[PDB]
Design an enzyme around this catalytic site. Sequence first.
Site, PDB file in Angstrom:
ATOM      1  N   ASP B 181      -6.299  -8.037   2.797  1.00 47.96           N
ATOM      2  CA  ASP B 181      -5.925  -6.990   1.819  1.00 47.96           C
ATOM      3  C   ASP B 181      -5.345  -7.603   0.543  1.00 47.96           C
ATOM      4  O   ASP B 181      -4.296  -7.190   0.048  1.00 47.96           O
ATOM      5  CB  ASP B 181      -4.934  -6.037   2.464  1.00 47.96           C
ATOM      6  N   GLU B 432      -1.900 -11.258  11.440  1.00 47.77           N
ATOM      7  CA  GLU B 432      -2.689 -10.156  11.982  1.00 47.77           C
ATOM      8  C   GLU B 432      -4.049 -10.561  12.556  1.00 47.77           C
ATOM      9  O   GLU B 432      -5.061  -9.907  12.294  1.00 47.77           O
ATOM     10  CB  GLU B 432      -2.869  -9.087  10.908  1.00 47.77           C
ATOM     11  N   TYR B 492       3.468   0.129  10.809  1.00 43.60           N
ATOM     12  CA  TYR B 492       3.305   1.152   9.771  1.00 43.60           C
ATOM     13  C   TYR B 492       3.354   2.542  10.364  1.00 43.60           C
ATOM     14  O   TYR B 492       2.602   3.457   9.949  1.00 43.60           O
ATOM     15  CB  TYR B 492       2.012   0.934   8.997  1.00 43.60           C
ATOM     16  N   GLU B 527       6.492  -6.871   8.222  1.00 48.29           N
ATOM     17  CA  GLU B 527       5.925  -5.875   7.309  1.00 48.29           C
ATOM     18  C   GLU B 527       6.227  -4.470   7.795  1.00 48.29           C
ATOM     19  O   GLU B 527       6.207  -4.191   8.998  1.00 48.29           O
ATOM     20  CB  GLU B 527       4.387  -5.978   7.170  1.00 48.29           C
TER      21      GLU B 527
HETATM   22  O1  LIG Z   1      -2.140  -2.533   4.776  1.00 46.92           O
HETATM   23  C1  LIG Z   1      -1.200  -3.205   4.140  1.00 46.92           C
HETATM   24  O2  LIG Z   1      -0.622  -2.783   3.139  1.00 46.92           O
HETATM   25  C2  LIG Z   1      -0.869  -4.579   4.716  1.00 46.92           C
HETATM   26  C3  LIG Z   1      -1.112  -4.592   6.224  1.00 46.92           C
HETATM   27  N1  LIG Z   1      -0.753  -5.928   6.774  1.00 46.92           N
HETATM   28  C4  LIG Z   1      -1.408  -7.048   6.124  1.00 46.92           C
HETATM   29  C5  LIG Z   1      -1.185  -7.037   4.627  1.00 46.92           C
HETATM   30  O3  LIG Z   1      -1.890  -8.090   3.945  1.00 46.92           O
HETATM   31  C6  LIG Z   1      -1.668  -5.700   4.035  1.00 46.92           C
HETATM   32  O4  LIG Z   1      -1.516  -5.671   2.635  1.00 46.92           O
END
Ligand SMILES: O=C(O)[C@H]1CNC[C@@H](O)[C@@H]1O
Lengths: 620, 620
Positions: B181, B432, B492, B527
């Site tokens: 991404d 990931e 997330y 993250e």
């Molecule tokens: O989906 C996203 O915003 C992130 C999810 N985990 C990996 C990141 O590179 C990515 O940018």
Amino acid sequence: NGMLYPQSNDSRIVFPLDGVWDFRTAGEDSYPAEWADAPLPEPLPMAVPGSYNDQNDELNLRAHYGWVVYQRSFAVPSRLVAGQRMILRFDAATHAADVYLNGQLLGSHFGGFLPFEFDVTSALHAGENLLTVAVDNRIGSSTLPVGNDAGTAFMGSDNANVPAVAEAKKHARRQNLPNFDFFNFAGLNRHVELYTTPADAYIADIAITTERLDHIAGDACTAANALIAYDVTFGGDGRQVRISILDGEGTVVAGVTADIERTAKASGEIAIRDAKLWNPGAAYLYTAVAELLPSRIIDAYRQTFGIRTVEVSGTTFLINGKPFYFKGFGKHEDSYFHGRGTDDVLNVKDVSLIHWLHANSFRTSHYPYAESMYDLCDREGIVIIDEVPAVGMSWLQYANPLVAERHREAIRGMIARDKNHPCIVMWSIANEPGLDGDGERPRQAYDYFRPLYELAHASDPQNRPVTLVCCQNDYTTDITERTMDVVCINRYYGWYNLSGDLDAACHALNIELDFWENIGKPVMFTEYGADTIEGIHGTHGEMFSEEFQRDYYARINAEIDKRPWFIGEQLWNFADFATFQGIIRVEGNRKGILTRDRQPKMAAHWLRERWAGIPDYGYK
Amino acid sequence: NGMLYPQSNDSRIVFPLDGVWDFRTAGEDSYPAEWADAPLPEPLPMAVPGSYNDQNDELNLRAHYGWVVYQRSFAVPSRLVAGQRMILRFDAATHAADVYLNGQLLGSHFGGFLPFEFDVTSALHAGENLLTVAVDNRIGSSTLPVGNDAGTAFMGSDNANVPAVAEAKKHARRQNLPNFDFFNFAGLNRHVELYTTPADAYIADIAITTERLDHIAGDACTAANALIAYDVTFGGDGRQVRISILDGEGTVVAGVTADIERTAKASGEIAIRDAKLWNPGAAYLYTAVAELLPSRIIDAYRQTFGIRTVEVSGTTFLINGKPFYFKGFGKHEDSYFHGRGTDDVLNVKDVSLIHWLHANSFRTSHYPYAESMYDLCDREGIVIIDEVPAVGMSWLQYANPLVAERHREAIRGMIARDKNHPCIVMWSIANEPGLDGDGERPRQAYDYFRPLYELAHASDPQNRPVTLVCCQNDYTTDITERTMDVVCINRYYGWYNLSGDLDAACHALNIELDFWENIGKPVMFTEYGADTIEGIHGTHGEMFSEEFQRDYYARINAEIDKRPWFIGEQLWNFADFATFQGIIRVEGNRKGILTRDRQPKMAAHWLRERWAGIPDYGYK
Ligand SMILES: O=C(O)[C@H]1CNC[C@@H](O)[C@@H]1O
Ligand SMILES: O=C(O)[C@H]1CNC[C@@H](O)[C@@H]1O
């Protein structure tokens, strides 16, 4: 003098005339007479109520100067007009209007923000009736609000010494140049309706006052006794009117039958034991039902009211004897497509946002608002400062008899329309007129405004406080603002001066607060703020960033919290709004704490947290 | 294996080759080899270092697939080169490069984020030299980072069942499809330089390690005694090297002479009394000066280091024996015109923003960063998790030996480059990769990653902890993440699932936290976040508003605060950054708490206030 809002009941019916009308633009100083006598040729659609300026993107109606003509047809059953008195009411036509029905002139009106009406009983006929309304948008040195006859709009840029500019000005298309910082939205901004009353005798006006409260409860929710007064005026022609007082559940709690005496009038007082009081944050409304008697009823009208007192005492502002603190803002009637057009969906949303913010008040900057907003604030417990459209004034206006008469009309008309609302606690007779300076100018301003202060007091049967909202000025030479009942100041330390330097802005503010500390009057902000573009951010927020707006209020509010005689904080503005175009207006005025679509900027969240911790009563 | 950054001193000089080079695009699978023999025809200008993609708006270089060719000339005085060993160093060429000097092919490199160099002593000549660098941007199923050979980029949209789509795909222009991404910025992203060393014998590598601390002060600022070890490698050909340890003020506080024994190495230990320790928020750096001895010095290199220990113990992460808590984020090397090009002005600014935020750490998502950023974090007391470009991986890669070799290369190269930095406390061997599922997939992933975990440990003389950053997955069938030294999870909840429902998101998170509670390892977020467009606001913030992003962190952080074994919060991302275009990327990834121009969104202010109250040591 009475302008009761039209009501439907067993004696009366209202026939709204809102909808999509026909429309044409016309000339800078005329329109075709034959457009009142037959259907408009090649008409455009135009919704009413609404400003016309943003309802057509093929034309540039924001640039229009002069007249437009609205028209529609309507028909009503002969059954319902038979024997009745028929009145055509315009809630507002901005700024001036000529009205025709079936090719007959009914009359004209100047004043873009207050209602007017015509008796059409004889001009109506059966079948389709043709209603034509010519509306003039022009403003200038004799109008309220004030326009500039030449030069620039308010806070506009110029290079007047450049010969080419001086010459091009002479031949430029005529345009209204507001001497006020909002767009000159025009047209049929509020509702239009036909209504009936009985013809032989009818209720023309009602005034309800809270005369005295005996032994107000500690929490101000009730009083042992409330003495209220009524004054009913009649039109038409040993007669009597029955007055019933209904509480919030519709229960009759008091009633008197009063004699009508010749203006035909009935007046009296009524004692209401264990009265439920109206308060900010805790509204309670009664109804006064007036019934003109002959078992049958000849006419009736239901007038909402609330029981409460307002009194300035020293440096306090007492509602029901409790020291109130204003939390709020100046507003505008302004929204994307409607312009200045009344929109009750938006009014309802805005009142909920006032609650979300934990504010308790606003000012009708800079003109009386639509009647439905005051009813809403009556039911929702939000206090209002009610202001006339006397904005843009200076010494040129004080010497003009026509301006002075329009100013008295606006004051009388606002108070006659709005006197029964419990939410209104104070009248404002102008916004930012010129008051300061050298020589005779301060005395000239004082001699202009003092009779208007007296007129506002004479006109209001509740005798509420009267103020004048003061622009940032040399407060040492202004001799007028300090004589008002409440001192209401607009200040922009750190925005229009000392720009960006909040330390210096707070030092300057404190120097002026030291001046007001000695005056002995309650003082409040009615404006202060910073233009802010949502989404502009900084770690050390500069002018136009969301952070600078938040820091601005954080620093200034910390200073006024140290002053016990400073009784309110109304900021500028509730929400971003449209203005004449110019180099300091980024798509209009951006001092809103909300965007024009009512979304909260950083400062709105900060203010909501502050205001959640400030009580309506007893903060100071 | 040593890649000491080039240094200038009495024995060595660096000649930078940055500036405006000549540039041409070339073919999808070839470039003209004859371009190395003569100046490029009709060249474009191209600044180095920088990505090339955003440096020309007449061409669409973001769409380029395949090769480009850089070229420049240089001259240096014969006196500079005489008798010296001449090395040409590429700090980074993304992703693969063929290098020519005066028409001679020096060699090739794959791996777009780590430095490589050539001995050019015999290829240089007097006068102007012609340096030609072909750079290949292509990614696919055997590269790190991983590209997709067909289909879409990562989280791209498709309608693969439409026959017209299937047919058009067969003839579409070739384009790199990142399985990651972030945008595939390519070119000479980091500095190029020619440097000299002595030819007969020279210092080739230095490793400094913190072996033991005795009696560490309660505040961790010092230790009574610190035992450090040195390991110097030499190139060329009873010889000795002088090792001097300089404190923060340049004072030589310790010195030893070591024997060089043969692959030439000198090794040993030094005890430092009252050693000043390196800590997050309180950096302290020594210099180890290695001087090759014959009066004179033959060669010299000055290696910065910091004295500190790192140890995982149970569910704690101990720095200098104190329980550390990570506050921070993943970052990117990403900025408007530079792309992935190194920019020290922006690195300096970013480290100041890290302090403004009261954060103490970040991860080099998803590739090793420029060397200068680690030097900066060394002096500024900011902890780093150092990560190789193994992003986009799944079972297709684990079965490919070329990928495993490229993965081992990246891990060895990263640790060889970065081992001396005190700011690095942990290695990440992938971001990931696919780990979960049924059948043999979880075990296949485990057998792929376990040797690389062992490799990272064997390569680092300091033996720091090793992690693998885990995507949101079925944690009950993943058998690999739970065997890492620290469990680093990307989650997330409430964004990519349970969207917008923060109550459900917190419930889901707590269910998974209950799982990790029983595993018994220290756990941290690497993250979590929400795309946010600055200036989008709401009273009840929805997805993409500033308020939702703030609410997201407020809710999630309240839950991890209840877990004593959860040892850090690194969010996604420090700042908005560029991605391949697609329906879920609004001008890139917008999960930054800062905008791409480093301005703070509402969430950044909230996090700043939160992090101001959380100590680097002892929070849990
Ligand atoms: O989906 C996203 O915003 C992130 C999810 N985990 C990996 C990141 O590179 C990515 O940018
Ligand atoms: O300048 C401003 O923002 C304000 C100054 N006081 C008057 C307001 O109408 C005006 O909008």
